[PDB]
Design a protein around this ligand. Structure first.
Ligand code: SF4
Ligand code: SF4
Ligand code: SF4
Ligand code: FES
Ligand SMILES: [Zn+2]
Lengths: 47, 693, 123, 57, 68, 117, 125, 82
């Protein structure tokens, strides 16, 4: 109001951002999967 | 020696005789489990860890199958997956539908591994329903919801083997097998709080913390416990402005993976009886006041009292950090005083073990040194109370190898067999000249444990003299590969105080102070303060010390600042601030810097990096964190400090007594905690709930 | 096609420092020349000499930057800013961000030594 | 539309402070605190919704 | 529109076929407390005043002096 | 009635509005702020405001305390708090309560108390 | 070694690189769970500021904050990468070296070892 | 000094060997020479031998003890004490 214009100020939140990523799983969730490579693109094994 | 085997195609080399699950863990293969734990005996009752080995026809328990040369292990066979699903299906059959109300929720292993290895749905819809289990009262610390027990026996294994509390066990048979005491008895041990972490499900739970938060909304900070002098590493879980709980984090050289009950449950004393605004005594009452008003009152008292030299006494309490001690000592020196005392009895005088060399007042054998012990003599100390995790360590050593323990001092309830040689200095003379002295002479890794409570006696010189003579004689106790001489501090701040020379001068102990500055300092009595003295208190809780003061200043607590603490080992550790101080409380060294400016002796540092520089100036081992380095002056120190100046001291005829009357309430925080108050009256010896017979 | 706009310069990272300082001085001259235009556009209370002083301070701040790539980036951002100002894309609110000093005194207590900072918990 | 907290026919509240609603809320509208009620039940001591953050999802 | 009682509000919106008075006893909520209907009070002294339902997190010390 | 403020001045509140609930006078949880404290701390925003219009729902602790104990034959009482009149799942998850111990044992979800007879 | 102030091209406030201290570490094995999936990444987060961390609004009781980094936490694949990043931004850091479980050989048969002397304790299973 | 002397020295370092010798041999002689001063010996791996003296009202002074002989260590200390 004193300056009659939109001013920029350091951020100050009334409620702070609560990051709930702290509760990520402690166990590996998916594993390795499987490979869908065609046999014509895998290196050959000797014998 | 180390043998070789293959796990899921990989090549992993492991010591012979190890369990297959150790090999899997080393090789980066994840195996589910419940009953297995790294610090407990192997049980193999959960059957979750099954794997296939080509030699065996049926899948084998990985936690209990010993490794052998050339073994081939598959953890990913269709049979293995079907096995995990079957085991989980059976596990969840009688498990209660309690997740929204279980405190474990969000950090429950049953949840995570059911989600990762179990089926998406269930098959058990029986009109007869599930089994139910009575709830059992085992004290005010560990709340029980035994419907959730999956019978992993971790709690039993820990309570029996690790903490030596055999009241816990399993009664009944088959479906009706219940973990408990079979009758109303408290789980009475100072390590009880750890079954909370060990129980993978919510069956055993923190009672003062119950229902107050959920794991995903907690900010986790790694910091340092200050309840005892061991220096346990802890994780501080806080949300917003208050601290929720304290849980251990691994440091295999200090506390392993355990903390004692005080460190765990005295957190609730940090949100009550707090100091938030400066106070000024006016008549017989305190009145709130501004920081400027307080500090100006201190300055005016200083100019009016006009202390010369040692008339400005400074006392440091059990809980304060190194930076605050350094600030206080520097300011007091710049006032011309040398009267920087500690808070312990006889703390007006210098300690009898000396300050010149670190190895005179430290656990010279590291805490890990106890693992190698073959004989230990305890002098005037009860480790079960002074250092609980170290007591557990001594216990584990005693269980797994032969070991001879004897003690001189009050009859102590121990978790390990001890030999009592007497309560007196004469009994120590007899022992060190007797059979147990011979045992120490013959031992390969002997170590002598001296309690800090002996240092507080007037006759501490005689004890230190006898021990120093014995040490300087016996090479096994003190050679170039092993220092068996050990002082066991009880307060987290004593080691740091001695490290910076927070020790009164000889002439200082004679003077009667006109101004006293208490930093912490809640063990002070009415006697140690002159009536005419002007007393300043600086702390975080309201206790007897603040009751004695004329001006009170609020300072931050150990969870609210990033300080340095030096444990019994001489290890220097750094903490991290979880939250900010409440109210108008301030960081302690900043308080000292500002008041010194008002006193005209302005300290040369006004920034944390400059504080660490001053600390490096005082000692180079304060800035080297998590490091222990042995003394090259082992032989010089003993002669120069323990046997040298203690010749004249006359031993008293008074018997050695217990250093701490009540394990649960020893600090300002602990005396401000309702939980410790409840625990103290619940876990009293004369209460049948804590007897057995 | 989509053609460039007014006072647009294609992005080019100068391979040599000297060829960059040529452009840098050109940009400084452009800013000094545009100062009165900025004073008209954004209805500023303060004077054209103060605009030019502010520009000189901004250019001064990076007078000792050595690595060439960082200088290239700073020059590109400075030109983007110039194009933003001169085309009246910016409003008065964002323009006055550049000018925090010409606002009035914010209050009686701006701490300078340790005791005043400490009293306000900013030590 | 607008939010409301329900009771059991006996008149005991249904919210047991499980805080899943707090964890799922995409606008972080919900703030909850809890502790053991004097009769031992797990109940909320503070349950706020900021109706100006909510996206009514 | 806030003065329409709940249940009638739903009927008037074509939520249900059967009006509240015509609904059987089985499909009526049981209440252990007296039922009171209050419309929207905004712009009046009866408007809702919000507040924190918890006392402060950290409790300060009650100062007490002792004699040396 | 009369609450002294931080100013040292007096705040007058009718007795009916100092009760925590219409049916209960005192708080039912340690962290719960009492009405007296609420007014003492928020009295600026309560001026010229009509307290009789504020929500004031009933305290459920007493309402569940008025419900009679259900006696069951066996060792386990099963509760799910369902609504037998409407369709769908409207109760709380089905749990089983052990009643071998002396006295009444409360359902963890709904508070209904069971006892073995 | 360390990028000074005012040649950082990020545009962050100068205060970030002047008077803030970050910490780099690996998460500790939680004591409550046996899983170890979160413990391999190298987190980077900011040490708190005393005045601006968190206060309580005097209306609805919320946690107000003036520290804009209180919720930020980066993940890195390795300690050297985290060091390089912090140096390139000009952040003062501290490294907290991780702690691991010391290996020991565990045998199920050890629960039944014959005792030639008096029993030190009755194992129970 | 009048009130406090502090000895900093590495445990394994070669540049600290005269310091280790000076301590190990005449620490008692130094203590008896100055019966009111408080003497501290503090060791750490990376640090260069230094000595610190604290005289009065917090005034402190330090000299480096990167020295060849135990003798020369002694006169460096004595020159500090004056
Ligand atoms: S113990 Fe785990 S699985 Fe069981 S109810 Fe609690 S959170 Fe759910
Ligand atoms: S209470 Fe917990 S630790 Fe003990 S047997 Fe049951 S599940 Fe295992
Ligand atoms: S806390 Fe939220 S999700 Fe849980 S019962 Fe209460 S309202 Fe429902
Ligand atoms: S963990 Fe191996 S059977 Fe339980
Ligand atoms: Zn129910």
């Amino acid at each position: 109001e004193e300056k009659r214009r939109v001013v920029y100020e350091p951020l100050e939140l009334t409620q702070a951002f609560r990051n709930f990523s702290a509760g990520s799983t402690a166990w590996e969730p998916v594993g390795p999967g499987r490979d869908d490579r065609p046999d014509s693109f895998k290196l050959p094994t000797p014998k | 020696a180390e043998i070789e085997l293959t796990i899921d195609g990989h090549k992993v080399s492991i010591e012979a005789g190890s369990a297959l699950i150790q090999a899997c863990e080393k090789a980066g293969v994840t195996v589910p489990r419940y009953c297995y734990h790294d610090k407990l005996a192997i049980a193999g009752n959960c059957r979750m860890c099954l794997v296939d080995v080509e030699r065996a026809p049926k899948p084998v328990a990985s936690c209990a199958y010993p490794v052998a040369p050339g073994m081939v292990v598959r953890t990913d066979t269709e049979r293995v997956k079907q096995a995990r699903e079957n085991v989980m299906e059976m596990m969840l059959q009688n498990h209660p539908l309690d997740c929204p109300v279980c405190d474990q929720g969000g950090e429950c292993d049953l949840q995570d591994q059911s989600m990762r290895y179990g089926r998406d749905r269930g098959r058990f819809t029986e009109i007869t329903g599930k089994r139910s289990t009575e709830d059992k009262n085992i004290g005010p610390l560990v709340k029980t919801s035994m419907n959730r027990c999956i019978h992993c026996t971790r709690c039993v294994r820990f309570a029996n083997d690790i903490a030596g509390a055999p009241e816990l066990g399993s009664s009944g048979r088959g479906n009706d097998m219940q973990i408990g005491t079979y009758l109303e008895k408290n789980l009475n041990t100072e390590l009880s709080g750890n079954v909370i972490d060990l129980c993978p499900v919510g069956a055993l739970t923190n009672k003062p913390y119950a229902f107050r938060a959920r794991p995903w909304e907690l900010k986790k900070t790694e910091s340092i416990d200050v309840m005892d002098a061991v220096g346990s590493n802890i994780r501080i879980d806080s949300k917003g402005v208050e601290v929720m709980r304290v849980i251990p984090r691994v440091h295999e050289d200090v506390n392993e993976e355990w903390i004692n009950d005080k460190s765990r449950f005295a957190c609730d004393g940090l949100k009550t009886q707090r100091l938030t605004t400066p106070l000024i005594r006016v008549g017989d009452k305190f009145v709130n006041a501004t920081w400027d008003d307080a500090l100006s009152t201190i300055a005016k008292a200083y100019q009016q009292k006009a202390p010369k030299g040692d008339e400005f006494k400074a006392v440091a309490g059990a809980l304060v950090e190194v930076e605050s001690m350094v600030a206080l000592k520097d300011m007091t020196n710049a006032l011309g005083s040398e009267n920087t005392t500690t808070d312990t009895p006889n703390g007006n005088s210098a300690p009898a073990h000396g300050i010149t060399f670190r190895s005179n007042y430290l656990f010279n054998s590291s805490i890990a040194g106890i693992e190698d012990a073959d004989a230990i003599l305890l002098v005037g100390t009860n480790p079960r109370r002074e250092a609980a995790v170290m007591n557990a360590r001594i216990r584990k050593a005693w269980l797994r190898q032969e070991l001879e323990i004897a003690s001189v001092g009050p009859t102590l309830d121990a978790t390990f067999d001890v030999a009592e040689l007497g309560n007196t200095h004469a009994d120590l003379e007899k022992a060190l000249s007797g059979e147990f002295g011979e045992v120490l002479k013959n031992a390969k890794n002997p170590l002598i444990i001296v309690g800090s409570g002996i240092t507080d006696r007037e006759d501490a010189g005689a004890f230190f003299n006898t021990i120093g003579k014995f040490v300087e004689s016996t090479p096994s106790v003190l050679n170039e590969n092993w220092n068996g001489y050990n002082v066991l501090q009880r307060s987290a701040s004593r080691a740091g105080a001695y490290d910076i020379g927070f020790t009164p001068s000889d002439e200082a102990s004679k003077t009667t102070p006109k101004m006293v500055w208490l930093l912490g300092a809640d063990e002070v009595a009415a006697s140690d303060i002159p009536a005419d003295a002007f007393v300043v208190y600086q702390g975080h809780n309201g206790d007897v010390g603040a009751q004695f003061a004329d001006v009170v200043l609020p300072g931050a607590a150990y969870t609210e600042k990033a300080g340095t603490y030096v444990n019994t080992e001489g290890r220097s550790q750094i903490s991290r601030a979880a939250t900010g101080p409440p109210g108008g409380a301030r960081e302690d060294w900043k308080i000292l810097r500002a008041v010194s400016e008002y006193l005209g002796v302005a300290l040369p540092y006004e920034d944390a990096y400059e504080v660490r520089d001053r600390l490096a100036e005082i000692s180079p081992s304060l800035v080297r964190y998590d490091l222990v380095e042995p003394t090259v002056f082992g032989d010089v120190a003993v002669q120069h400090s323990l046997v040298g100046p203690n010749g004249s001291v006359t031993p008293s005829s008074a018997p050695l007594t217990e250093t701490i009357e009540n394990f649960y309430m020893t600090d300002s925080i602990s005396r401000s905690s309702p939980t410790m108050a409840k625990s103290s009256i619940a876990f009293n010896k004369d209460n049948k709930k804590n007897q057995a017979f | 096609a989509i053609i460039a706009t007014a006072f647009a310069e294609t992005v080019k990272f100068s391979g040599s420092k000297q060829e960059l300082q040529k452009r840098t001085l050109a940009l400084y001259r452009q800013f000094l020349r545009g100062a009165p235009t900025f004073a008209d556009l954004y209805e500023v209370q303060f004077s054209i000499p103060t605009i030019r002083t502010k520009i000189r301070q901004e250019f001064e701040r990076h007078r000792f930057v050595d690595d060439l790539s960082i200088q290239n980036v700073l020059y590109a951002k400075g030109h983007m800013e110039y194009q933003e100002c001169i085309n009246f894309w910016k409003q008065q609110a964002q323009f006055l961000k550049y000018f925090p000093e010409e606002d009035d005194i914010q209050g009686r207590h701006q701490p300078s030594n340790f005791v005043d900072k400490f009293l306000k918990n900013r030590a | 539309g607008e939010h409301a907290l329900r009771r059991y026919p006996s008149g005991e509240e249904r919210c047991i402070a499980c805080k899943l609603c707090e964890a799922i809320c995409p606008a972080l509208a919900i703030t909850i605190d809890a502790e053991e009620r004097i009769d031992g039940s797990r109940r909320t001591t503070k349950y706020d919704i900021d109706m100006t953050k909510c996206i009514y999802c | 529109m806030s003065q329409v009682e709940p249940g009638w509000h739903f009927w008037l919106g074509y939520g249900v076929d059967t009006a509240p008075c015509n609904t059987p006893k089985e499909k009526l909520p049981i209440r252990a407390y007296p039922y009171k209907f209050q419309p929207n009070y905004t712009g009046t002294p009866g408007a809702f005043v919000t507040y924190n339902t918890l006392k402060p997190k950290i409790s300060a010390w009650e100062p007490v002096t002792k004699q040396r | 009635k009369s609450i002294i403020s931080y100013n040292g001045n007096t705040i007058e509140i009718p007795e009916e509005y100092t009760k925590q609930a219409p049916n209960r006078d005192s708080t039912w949880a340690p962290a719960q702020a009492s009405k007296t404290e609420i007014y003492k701390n928020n009295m600026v925003r309560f001026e010229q405001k009509d307290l009789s219009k504020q929500p004031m729902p009933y305290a459920g602790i007493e309402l569940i305390a008025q419900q009679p104990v259900r006696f069951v034959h066996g060792n386990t009482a099963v509760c799910d708090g369902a609504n037998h009149n409407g369709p769908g799942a409207q109760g709380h998850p089905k749990i089983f309560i052990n009643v071998d111990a002396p006295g009444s044992h409360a359902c963890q979800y709904c508070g209904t108390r069971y006892e073995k007879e | 070694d360390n990028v000074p102030a005012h040649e950082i091209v990020s545009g962050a406030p100068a205060e970030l690189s002047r008077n803030r201290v970050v910490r780099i570490y690996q998460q500790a094995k939680p004591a409550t769970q046996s899983g170890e999936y979160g413990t391999f990444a190298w987190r980077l987060d900011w040490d708190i500021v005393d005045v601006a961390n968190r206060w309580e609004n005097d209306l609805i009781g919320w946690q107000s904050s003036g520290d804009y980094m209180q919720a930020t936490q980066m993940k890195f694949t390795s300690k050297e990468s985290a060091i390089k990043f912090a140096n390139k931004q000009g952040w003062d850091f501290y490294i907290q070296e991780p702690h691991h479980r010391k290996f020991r050989v565990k045998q199920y048969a050890n629960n039944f070892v014959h005792s030639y002397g008096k029993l030190k304790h009755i194992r129970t299973k | 000094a009048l009130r406090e002397i502090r000895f900093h020295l590495c445990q394994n370092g070669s540049s600290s060997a005269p310091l280790r010798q000076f301590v190990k041999n005449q620490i008692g002689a130094f203590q008896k020479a100055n019966p009111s001063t408080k003497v501290l010996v503090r060791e750490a791996n990376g640090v260069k031998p230094i000595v610190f003296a604290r005289f009065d009202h917090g005034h402190e002074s330090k000299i480096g003890l990167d020295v060849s002989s135990e003798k020369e260590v002694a006169e460096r200390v004595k020159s500090l004490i004056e």
